[PDB]
Amino acid sequence: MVQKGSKVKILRKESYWYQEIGNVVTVEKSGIKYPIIVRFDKVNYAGVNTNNFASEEVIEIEAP
Amino acid sequence: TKSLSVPFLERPKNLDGTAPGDVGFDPLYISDLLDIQWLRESEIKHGRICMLAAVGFIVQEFVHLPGEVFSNKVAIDALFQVPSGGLWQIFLFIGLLEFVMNKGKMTPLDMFSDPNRKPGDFGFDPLGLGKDPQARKRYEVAEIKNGRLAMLAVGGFIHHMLLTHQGVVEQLTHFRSL
């Protein structure tokens, strides 16, 4: 289960962080189309280091 | 808080007075730039080479192997006289020693990876001269002090030979000033 503190690999192809690992910051309730908030070490081209993903778009690596 | 040998300077943090030869001498604070374990190993190794080299310089002035190739009583000139093929065999044998003695761990990153590895200690005491703990501790300091002295001596011997082109003893007996 993806939850706060999980390390996840990104599977969204249009993402700056495609195939990279980020840290889950929060998971939103339900009904939200992209509830998994992930933070990254690298900034993208716009200068941001956080993005929202669906469950389909991520896969867990580490447990917490 | 101060160095023992240079009393107006703060003691270098990595010199704790434990290691043999330590009188807190590091006024340039090199032991802050470089790893102290690697520095200690390097110091002993430079010392052991120079001890042999010092003896080498003298004995080569008197004793020789057979042949005119192994003549020449000036050590720096003898380097270019002897067979070059022989120097390669020494070099490659030293290479093998360096590899085996250090168990293939030859850099500051890995040489002291094993906790038991201590600078200069290759477990070489055939005759068992350092069986007594107290005697060995004295010998550790004597080894370093003699190595330090031999380093400066060999520095002399070489520069004297470059200046005169005479042997060590030849120069003393026939001392010519500048």
């Binding site: 700056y16 962080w17 939103e28 009904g31 939200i32 189309k33 992209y34 993208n44 716009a46 929202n52 | -």
Partner: protein
């Protein structure tokens, strides 16, 4: 006119609407995000295609997109 589209990754931050100098965009109610709103482009006949909206958008990739299209006096920004 230029085409402006808003995709469902919008997080309803309002920054595109605030950035727009031609009042092309507005926020409308939505269920899809925590902010309970989405950007909308009801007045694209006034869009000049400056792309300030896209500059403002924090999502990766963008949630608002401007496809430059058929030019008009409005879109070319002519005062003559």
């Amino acid at each position: 006119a230029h085409n402006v589209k808003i995709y469902d990754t919008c997080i309803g931050c309002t920054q595109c609407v605030r950035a727009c100098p031609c009042d092309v965009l507005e926020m409308v109610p939505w269920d899809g995000c925590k902010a309970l709103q989405i950007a909308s482009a009801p007045r694209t006949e006034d869009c000049v295609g400056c792309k300030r909206c896209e500059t403002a958008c924090p999502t990766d990739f963008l949630s608002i997109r401007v496809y430059l299209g058929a030019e008009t006096s409005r879109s070319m920004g002519l005062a003559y």
